Each structure stands twice: as C-alpha cells, then as structure tokens.
Amino acid sequence: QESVKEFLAKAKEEFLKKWESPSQNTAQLDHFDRIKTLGTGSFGRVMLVKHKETGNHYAMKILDKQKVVKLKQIEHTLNEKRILQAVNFPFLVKLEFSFKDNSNLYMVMEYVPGGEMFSHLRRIGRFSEPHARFYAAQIVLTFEYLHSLDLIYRDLKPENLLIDQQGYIQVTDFGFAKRVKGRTWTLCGTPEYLAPEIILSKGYNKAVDWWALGVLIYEMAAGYPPFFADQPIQIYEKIVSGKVRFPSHFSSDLKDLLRNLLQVDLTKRFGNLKNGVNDIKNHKWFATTDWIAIYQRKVEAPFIPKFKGPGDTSNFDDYEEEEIRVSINEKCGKEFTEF
Ligand SMILES: O=C(NC[C@H]1O[C@H](CCO)CC[C@@H]1O)Nc1ccccc1
C-alpha cells in the first residue's frame, strides 16, 4: 500500500540526514551516579546510572578502548554508535548521549526495567503461540524498517530483546549491525542463531536476519533452539544439514512458516524472495495479527513484567562490581577519532 511505501521513504530520508552528520560528545562521566552492573562481556559492560541534575535513569554501555582494539572490534563499535544515533523506531532502544575519554567509549541509552526476554522465557518454560506471535510481529516490523535503510542487524537472540513497561520489545546491542549494499563477509553472531552461509564463509546478505527470526520463533514456542548441541562444531553440522524436528504441540501453520524461514538455500528463504517481507506478513500463521495496531502499540500485551519503578533492577542479575577507571593518559586516540 502507498501509505507503507511513503512511511518507509520518509524513514530513509530521516536516517540518511543523521547518518551523514553524526552527533558527538553530548555528555561526560561525572554528570552521572553509578548504581549497578547489569551485564558484562569481554570488552565492555552495561551499568544502571542516574543523571545527577535531572534524576533520570539510564543504561550506560562502557567499552574499554584498548580491549576493543585487541579483540578487533574497532569498526564494529564505530558502526554501533553511528547507526544508533541515526535510527528511530518504536521497538528499538533509544540512544540519548554518547561521549569518550582517555580510556573508554560511552553510549547512554534509555533504561528498560522489565529485563531480558531470555529470563522470562526460561522462567515460564515456553510461550504460547499467541504470545510468541506478538513478539515475532514486532521483530518482523523492525527488520522491515532496518532492511529498508540497508542495515543488517546480525545479533538476534532472546538476551538482546528487552521487555518494557507496556510489555512490548525494545531491541538492544547494535555491536554487529552494519550498513551493507550487497554482501558482507565477517564471521559474527551467536552459534545457535547463525545462518548456513555464515558458517560456510560465504558472502551473505539480509537473508541471515530472516533465518535468525526462524530460530527465535522456534525457541519462543518450544523453550529450546532447533539446532541445540554441546559444542559449536556440533551445532554447525546440524545447521548446515538444516534437519529440524518440530514438537507435536506446534500448529501446522507454525511448522509451515518455520520450514520457509529455516530454508538452507538463501535464494528460497522467506524474506528474501520477490515479495520480500510480505511473504511473511501474509502467511497463515500471522492471520490474526493487526500489523498497524502493533506498530501503534494499541494491542494489549500478553504479559507485563513485575517491577517497582524506573530504578528497579530486580529483573537483572548480579555481577561483581568493578571500578570505572580513566587513565591519566589518552589511549588509542587515532583509532576512535570519529566516535
Ligand atoms: O544493552 C544491554 N545489554 C547488551 C550487552 O551489553 C554488554 C556488552 C558489552 O560489550 C554486556 C552483555 C549485554 O548482553 N542492556 C540494556 C540496555 C538498555 C536498557 C537496559 C539494559
């Protein structure tokens, strides 16, 4: 419909203006009080902070420049910040400030107190098909938006989907997101969610996001992923065979959609045919979905997370609390000039 075409043309106009003139240096560390570590990895952390003058809460992602260089993530971290400051969509976490200092890179995002979908899925066991469908529709619309901007996301998994105060999704972690006209080649992502053409070291495209959507829908509805095994190399063998067994409680319509998303031949995979995303939106499994109502956030959610207020951390787990050091000397200044 022309209304969808004009929505996506305006979305691309607004993205390109910010993409071509990125914002820089819009706060500093001592404008915030540190509260709690919410997550930690090999080159960065995410901490709950409070802004000292306004009182507002944020999630502050802190990346150690020297560790980013050693793990060969320079280009990826520059991608992440330039994309996040240019996008705008209901189901994407919002970047409010960014800055850098002698030691670290900082991205300050809105705080989402409901926690990760991963926690709720493991607590409940599995989601009913209507519950899984509500979350899946939000991911279909978000990928339609990102792909129209020539962006590939490349890190879909339940840990990266936060649940907000209305029970809707906010997608976080753009560490592997990239603007790609054509193909790209980097090996990245989590093993259970990787498409076959990534495992086989091929030039790949946006079709890898539609494969990962098939993995996510299967995991939401079954409680475990389709290609499960104990070591990555065993997971990879199952993925390139693409032999998928479905639980008997799955509906016939769910099995049919998953066979077309978990298609090993990328030239036959739903999302990557002539009709694009509309082969997914018009599939029988989505026949009860009101796409406009989801976008407008007018549908009542299946589940509202339990929390006490905008500073509550009870839906995140506990980590050792480490210093945020800032060296007296500048580190890696050249490499991060554009940040
Ligand atoms: O963004 C969020 N988590 C993303 C990842 O960040 C770290 C990676 C450092 O390189 C550690 C692992 C974590 O899964 N949380 C987050 C974001 C916004 C609001 C509330 C929570």
UniProtKB/Swiss-Prot annotation:
Membrane protein topology class: Lipid-anchor
Active site residues per record: 155 (proton acceptor)
Residues with PTM Phosphothreonine: 37, 184, 186
Catalysed transformations (reactions): L-seryl-[protein] + ATP = O-phospho-L-seryl-[protein] + ADP + H(+); L-threonyl-[protein] + ATP = O-phospho-L-threonyl-[protein] + ADP + H(+)
UniProtKB keywords: ATP-binding, cAMP, Cell membrane, Cytoplasm, Kinase, Lipoprotein, Membrane, Mitochondrion, Myristate, Nucleotide-binding, Nucleus, Phosphoprotein, Serine/threonine-protein kinase, Transferase
Compartmental location: Cytoplasm; Cell membrane; Membrane; Nucleus
Positions of modified residues (Phosphotyrosine): 319
GO CC entries: acrosomal vesicle; axoneme; cAMP-dependent protein kinase complex; centrosome; ciliary base; cytoplasm; cytosol; glutamatergic synapse
SUPFAM superfamilies: Protein kinase-like (PK-like)
Tissue specificity remark: Ubiquitously expressed in mammalian tissues.
GO biological process terms on file: adenylate cyclase-activating G protein-coupled receptor signaling pathway; adenylate cyclase-inhibiting G protein-coupled receptor signaling pathway; cellular response to cold; cellular response to glucagon stimulus; cellular response to glucose stimulus; cellular response to heat; cellular response to parathyroid hormone stimulus; intracellular potassium ion homeostasis
Chief location: cytoplasm
Activity regulation information from UniProt: Allosterically activated by various compounds, including ATP. Activated by cAMP; the nucleotide acts as a dynamic and allosteric activator by coupling the two lobes of apo PKA, enhancing the enzyme dynamics synchronously and priming it for catalysis.
Domain AGC-kinase C-terminal: 287-339
Post-translational modification: Autophosphorylated. Phosphorylation is enhanced by vitamin K(2). Phosphorylated on threonine and serine residues. Phosphorylation on Thr-186 is required for full activity. Phosphorylated at Tyr-319 by activated receptor tyrosine kinases EGFR and PDGFR; this increases catalytic efficiency.
GO molecular function: ATP binding; cAMP-dependent protein kinase activity; magnesium ion binding; manganese ion binding; protein domain specific binding; protein kinase A regulatory subunit binding; protein kinase binding; protein serine kinase activity
Domain Protein kinase: from-to ranges: 32-286
Modified-residue entries (Phosphoserine), positions: 128, 327
Top-rank taxon: Eukaryota
One Pfam match: Pkinase
Protein family per UniProt: Belongs to the protein kinase superfamily. AGC Ser/Thr protein kinase family. cAMP subfamily.
Subunit structure, interactors included: A number of inactive tetrameric holoenzymes are produced by the combination of homo- or heterodimers of the different regulatory subunits associated with two catalytic subunits. cAMP causes the dissociation of the inactive holoenzyme into a dimer of regulatory subunits bound to four cAMP and two free monomeric catalytic subunits. Activates cAMP-sensitive PKAI and PKAII holoenzymes by interacting with regulatory subunit (R) of PKA, PRKAR1A/PKR1 and PRKAR2A/PKR2, respectively. Interacts with NFKB1, NFKB2 and NFKBIA in platelets; these interactions are disrupted by thrombin and collagen.
Function: Phosphorylates a large number of substrates in the cytoplasm and the nucleus. Phosphorylates CDC25B, ABL1, NFKB1, CLDN3, PSMC5/RPT6, PJA2, RYR2, RORA, SOX9 and VASP. Regulates the abundance of compartmentalized pools of its regulatory subunits through phosphorylation of PJA2 which binds and ubiquitinates these subunits, leading to their subsequent proteolysis. RORA is activated by phosphorylation. Required for glucose-mediated adipogenic differentiation increase and osteogenic differentiation inhibition from osteoblasts. Involved in chondrogenesis by mediating phosphorylation of SOX9.
Protein name: cAMP-dependent protein kinase catalytic subunit alpha
Species: Cricetulus griseus (Chinese hamster)
Organismal lineage: Eukaryota, Metazoa, Chordata, Craniata, Vertebrata
Gene name tied to this protein: PRKACA
